[PDB]
């Protein structure tokens, strides 16, 4: 590897970086180094070139592509190394940036006018309840609305009038309404409980007129008259001139505001709100010290009076203005040019040369990567990102362990920690034992990286470790919940960090089908927000349903419409890149996405069907599923075994179902040597982790290394009874599976856990589908709702899987890929597709995906909750002693193959099952006994 490093630096920051860059490369003179070094040498040079201080101006070239660029060095657009760069390059009708500046400046000088009431003064001094009857943002909104109703609010002297209690402060003037919504929602968004309003309201002001004081601001309301008697000590020199210059800025630019569309207004006001909380939290974090008394805004850690309200308003204004400037004029730090990506894929990765069919100069890209598992999907996503140049992306993945797997792939192929940042925000205690030096695994949290210039506008220089890893990451391999808060939050400033993260970075969401329906709705909201700033969305899901692919394209198309009309460019359409392991297709799609997507789906189906059938599923006829499991285990051991040894996966639905199947199979008298494992999610930290590592090392069938992790000498049935934790994110390879039916994507995923690593075709049948789910004996009205898309609004007419599924069927992604809306009441696949198009629709609703008008409100974050689960309290095992109503028990010790013990950790119990003892056990975790 031959590199060349050039320095642009002034100071002796052309000198103390010269020591480190002259420790690793030869000096060719004139502050230019050039030579041969290894990739780990590149990583070491990066780590000790960035850590040496601020102001390092370093460009590296590997062959002729730029390896890395330290700082905001413009470096190369076409040629490299410019001459002098001075000022005044373009200076356009910027319009919408002047609009955002005027809105943020006018609102930020009015965002805390409502702290001047006597209640907030005695709240800061501390002789009343610290919770206000009406929040000060609403009081400042009442001030601004009363001033606007009285005088002309855009060109007049200010003077705060006598204000009363107003239920609504939103009128008709679109720009005033924007300023009012920025003022009122500078801490939290208003929440609308009204069902008719949630049913009908769509527009900007027409929804904003329904935002009343009862949506969170009106806490208790007994001291309203003191909350609206206000002093007017803000009339000073610099506050009045700042208010005048920003109001006239808005006055001069609001003529382009009425030429915007609804989508524009929503996205622009979201940006304005994010910059306003950025400036407000930035000025509230630091201590300024000086004060002019008689009025105060915030308190220090000692509770003393600080940050008087005139200079508080001025500081929040300038900090929000500077926030806006750096978030709207940033050339963000991108990743290194990974040299182990750009070469050809060989063999089964040979489809990854589809990036040589995509244009490298497209400003936008919507990848739908429909490639099957085991083909290197995430490597292909990184290849697609690097085809357009240097990489800046957020790999948002479900589960901690899947982020760990993608991080380990990124580490061992070409990516160091100067470009990658693995973020899992829980600090799990799963450590690697055996040998620390001989590990060559366990990707960790260090991020030598490079701190971006956006950290100076965040509160108190961003944060410590976690938010520095969030914001400053070129490549952010993260759990997805660090990105879905970009679309907005209930309370606080947790929106700004993923918002500013997704503003300048691409978004790569892998296996989006494993998320929930509301989770997928907020993920497509994130896709729309990412496309709002021209970034590229890579979706990587093999079993995509047309509905999902369509609504994600429509979210990207609305976002790219926002980005196109935001830079005053005519919208040519979205560069959609359909991708699988058989080919690629790049089309400029502005309309008719459905026929092209279904034609690619049909081409992928015909490229999947002439291949040999790997998963032949038979739906059993035996009604009782206990003895159906027995007979199917006996049949698939007598048919599918490797010299007497067979691996079976009993995929069931819930935990007590799993322990019921386990306790039946343990007490089942047979000549077969059944060896039973329980693989559900309710387990203690230690025990769970141990199951994972063992299962990953015994079900690895790409080699014969497993022969030494199990007793393959004696003919044995190694059976793993598992819940849907096996069908998501597990690289497992079973000889056969017996599936309790809950949803068709569960069938396709548990087919993907059988012969995942081998290529031998089954002869007779490798999957035995149960006749009924076990909830049929508990609830015959609805049985597929647990881990399925059946529900109270979408009920199957019959629950028989002979009626709702094929008796003999080759299970692949084809049934999920096709998409059928008719006959959803008597087939599982059409039931699935129905729900997917009836929840992820092209409407705005309130919990929908095109959400417009409601982004202003708190409604999409309350009624569409990301990871909406049950109450979930956590019973914690502390050194062998349980906390709550747990009561350790003893398992049946009949056929347990492996049982790992646990002493620490915690189990997640729903509040429903907290009533009784969860009865934790070493073999199977939680049950009802």
């Amino acid at each position: 590897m031959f590199i060349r490093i050039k320095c642009f630096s002034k100071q002796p920051i052309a000198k103390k970086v010269s020591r480190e860059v002259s420790a690793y490369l030869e000096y060719t003179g004139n502050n230019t180094w050039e030579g041969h070094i290894s990739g780990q040498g590149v990583s070491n040079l990066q780590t000790k070139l960035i850590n040496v201080g601020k102001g390092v101006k370093v460009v590296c070239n590997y062959q002729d592509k730029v390896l890395f660029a330290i700082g905001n060095v413009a470096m190369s657009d076409t040629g490299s190394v410019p001459k002098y760069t001075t000022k005044k390059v373009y200076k356009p009708d910027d319009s919408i940036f002047t609009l955002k500046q005027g809105l943020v400046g006018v609102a930020a000088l009015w965002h805390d006018l409502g702290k001047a009431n006597s209640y907030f003064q005695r709240k800061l001094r501390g002789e009343c309840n610290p919770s206000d009857p009406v929040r000060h943002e609403w009081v400042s909104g009442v001030i601004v609305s009363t001033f606007a109703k009285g005088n002309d609010w855009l060109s007049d002297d200010f003077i705060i009038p006598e204000v009363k209690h107003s239920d609504n402060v939103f009128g008709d003037d679109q720009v005033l309404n924007a300023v009012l919504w920025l003022i009122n929602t500078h801490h939290k968004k208003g929440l609308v409980e009204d069902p008719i309003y949630r049913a009908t309201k769509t527009m900007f002001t027409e929804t904003l007129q329904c935002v009343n004081v009862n949506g969170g601001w009106f806490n208790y309301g007994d001291n309203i008259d003191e909350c609206y008697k206000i002093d007017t000590s803000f009339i000073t020199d610099t506050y009045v001139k700042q208010l005048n210059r920003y109001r006239k800025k808005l006055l001069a630019t609001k003529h382009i505001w009425f030429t915007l569309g609804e989508d524009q207004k929503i996205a622009i006001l979201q940006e304005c709100r994010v910059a306003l909380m950025l400036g407000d939290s930035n000025f509230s974090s630091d201590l300024i010290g000086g004060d002019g008394s008689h009025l105060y805004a915030n308190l220090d850690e000692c509770g003393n009076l600080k940050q008087t309200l005139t200079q508080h308003l001025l500081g929040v204004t300038d900090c929000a203005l500077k926030a806006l400037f750096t978030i709207n004029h940033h050339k963000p730090v991108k990743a290194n040019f990974i040299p182990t990506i750009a070469e050809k894929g060989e063999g089964k990765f040979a489809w990854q040369n589809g990036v040589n069919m995509v244009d490298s100069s497209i400003d936008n890209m919507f990848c739908i990567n429909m490639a099957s598992t085991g083909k290197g999907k995430t490597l292909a996503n990184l290849k697609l990102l690097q085809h357009f140049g240097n990489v800046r992306c957020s790999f948002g993945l479900g589960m901690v362990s899947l982020t760990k797997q993608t991080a380990k792939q990124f580490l061992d192929m070409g990516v160091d920690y100067n470009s990658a940042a693995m973020v899992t925000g829980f600090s799990k205690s799963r450590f690697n034992l055996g040998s620390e030096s001989l590990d060559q695994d366990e990707v960790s949290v260090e991020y030598w990286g490079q701190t971006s210039s956006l950290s100076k506008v965040f509160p108190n220089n961003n944060a410590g470790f976690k938010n520095k890893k969030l914001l400053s990451a070129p490549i952010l391999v993260t759990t997805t919940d660090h990105l879905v808060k970009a679309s907005g939050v209930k309370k606080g400033n947790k929106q700004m960090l993923p918002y500013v993260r997704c503003m300048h970075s691409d978004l790569v969401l892998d296996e989006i089908d494993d998320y929930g329906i509301e989770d997928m709705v907020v993920l497509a909201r994130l896709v729309y927000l990412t496309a709002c700033y021209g970034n590229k969305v890579i979706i990587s899901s093999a079993t995509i349903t047309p509905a999902i692919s369509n609504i994600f394209y429509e979210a990207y198309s609305s976002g790219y419409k926002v980005f196109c009309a935001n830079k005053q460019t005519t919208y040519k359409g979205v560069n959609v890149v359909w991708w699988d392991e058989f080919g690629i297709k790049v089309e400029k799609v502005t309309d008719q996405f459905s026929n092209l997507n279904t034609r690619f789906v049909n081409k992928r189906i015909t490229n999947l069907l002439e291949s040999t059938p790997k998963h032949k599923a038979l739906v059993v006829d035996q009604d009782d599923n206990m003895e159906a499991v027995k007979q199917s285990i006996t049949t698939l051991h007598n048919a599918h075994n490797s010299g007497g040894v067979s691996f079976g996966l009993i995929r069931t639905t819930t935990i007590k179902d799993c322990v019921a199947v386990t306790q039946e199979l343990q007490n089942w008298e047979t000549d077969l040597s059944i060896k039973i494992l329980c693989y559900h999610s309710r387990f203690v930290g230690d025990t769970k982790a141990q199951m994972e590592e063992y299962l990953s090392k015994v079900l690895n069938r790409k080699g014969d290394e497993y022969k030494k992790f199990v007793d393959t000498t004696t003919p044995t049935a190694y059976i793993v009874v598992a819940t849907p934790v096996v069908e998501v994110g597990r690289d497992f390879d079973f000889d056969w599976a017996i599936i309790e039916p809950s949803s068709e994507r569960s069938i396709v995923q548990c087919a993907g856990r059988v012969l995942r690593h081998r290529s031998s075709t089954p002869t007779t049948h490798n999957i035995h589908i149960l006749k009924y789910p076990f909830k049929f004996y508990r609830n015959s009205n609805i049985c597929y709702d647990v881990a399925g898309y059946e529900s109270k609004g979408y009920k199957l007419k019959s629950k028989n899987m002979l009626d709702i599924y094929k008796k003999e069927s080759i299970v692949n992604s084809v049934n999920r890929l096709q998409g059928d809306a008719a006959f959803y009441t008597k087939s599982l696949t059409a039931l699935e597709h129905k729900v997917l198009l009836d929840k992820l629709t092209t409407d705005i609703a309130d919990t929908n995906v095109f959400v417009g008008g409601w982004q202003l409100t708190a409604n999409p974050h309350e009624y569409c909750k990301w990871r909406r689960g049950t109450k979930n309290e956590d019973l914690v095992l502390t050194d062998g002693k349980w906390s709550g109503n747990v009561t350790t028990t003893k398992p049946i010790q009949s056929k347990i193959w492996r049982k790992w013990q646990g002493e620490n950790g915690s189990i997640t119990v729903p509040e429903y099952l907290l009533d009784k003892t969860i009865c934790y056990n070493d073999f199977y975790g939680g049950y009802e006994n």
């Binding site: 002729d64 413009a74 190369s76 657009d77 076409t78 001459k83 002098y84 373009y90 040589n356 069919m357």
Partner: protein
């Protein structure tokens, strides 16, 4: 300027994209729309090109022309099949050698002499293939390429009309383009308005060969306005004969290799510089028109 580098030994080669071309402090440079000023070596430049969003000034054009750099503008194609119109500023202030133009005129006006020159220039692409052999792509001396160039030479030997030359021209272009398509395992159709990389790399090489051909013709004073091959489809001037002498030998395998390896356009620019410089394709074209003119 002493002895300005003979045009045939001029080496630098650019097509400037999305930058206003100007002069700072003595040298011709181009300034992009981010503040970056990259200098142009005008004393060694063969040609510059101007893509969308480009704007050159007066004294920059003067310093290119007086040094002898042919300058064209890439856009202008508006038909469905043809590279329609490329606008090209000739440095005529340098007074040119004359008798090569007289020889070209004495062969152009005589119809049987133009046909004879048409003959030798059609087999000139055949010998271009034989001389300029790349390390990648196809091998020239295989059975299929030799069979098609043998059929081409046999047909162009017995040809007697320019429309027969146009037909045989079409079968030659279809034969080569499709054989390269077969080698690189793609389906290929030559459309100048296509998003596929094998096509816009071919249009970029069309612009590159256009610039090479006007520098070769201007180095001997030959105008584009004397096309020895003419027709309804083939109406571009002499540049659409001295430019596509070197498609199927130089540009089209290089365009297919660049669209197969699939990095950006700049590696294709630099590869065109490297092959036009290493094998001296400009001096090769000039010397071939030299042995054309005096025979």
């Amino acid at each position: 300027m002493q002895k300005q580098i003979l045009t045939s030994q001029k080496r630098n080669m650019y097509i400037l994209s999305r930058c206003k071309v100007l002069v700072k402090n003595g040298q011709v440079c181009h300034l992009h729309e981010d503040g970056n000023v990259y200098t142009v070596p005008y004393a060694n430049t063969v040609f510059i090109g101007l893509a969308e969003g480009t704007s050159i000034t007066n004294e920059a054009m003067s310093m290119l022309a007086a040094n002898g750099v042919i300058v064209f503008w890439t856009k202008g194609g508006g038909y469905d099949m043809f590279a329609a119109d490329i606008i090209c500023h000739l440095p005529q202030a340098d007074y040119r050698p004359t008798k090569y133009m007289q020889n070209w005129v004495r062969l152009w006006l005589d119809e049987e002499k133009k046909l004879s020159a048409a003959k030798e220039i059609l087999k000139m692409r055949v010998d271009s293939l034989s001389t300029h052999v790349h390390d990648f792509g196809v091998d020239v001396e295989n059975k299929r390429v030799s069979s098609i160039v043998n059929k081409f030479d046999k047909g162009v030997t017995q040809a007697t009309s320019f429309e027969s030359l146009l037909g045989h021209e079409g079968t030659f272009v279809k034969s080569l383009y499709k054989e390269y398509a077969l080698e690189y395992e793609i389906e290929f159709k030559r459309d100048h308005k296509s998003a596929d990389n094998y096509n816009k790399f071919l249009t970029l090489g069309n612009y590159y060969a256009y610039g090479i051909a006007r520098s070769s013709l201007w180095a001997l004073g030959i105008d584009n306005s004397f096309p020895l091959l003419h027709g309804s489809t083939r109406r571009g001037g002499l540049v659409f004969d001295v430019a596509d002498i070197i498609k199927t030998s130089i540009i089209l395998p290089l365009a297919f290799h660049a669209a197969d390896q699939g990095m950006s356009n700049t590696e294709f620019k630099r590869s065109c510089v490297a092959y036009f410089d290493k094998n001296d394709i400009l001096a090769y074209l000039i010397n071939n028109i030299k042995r054309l003119c005096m025979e």
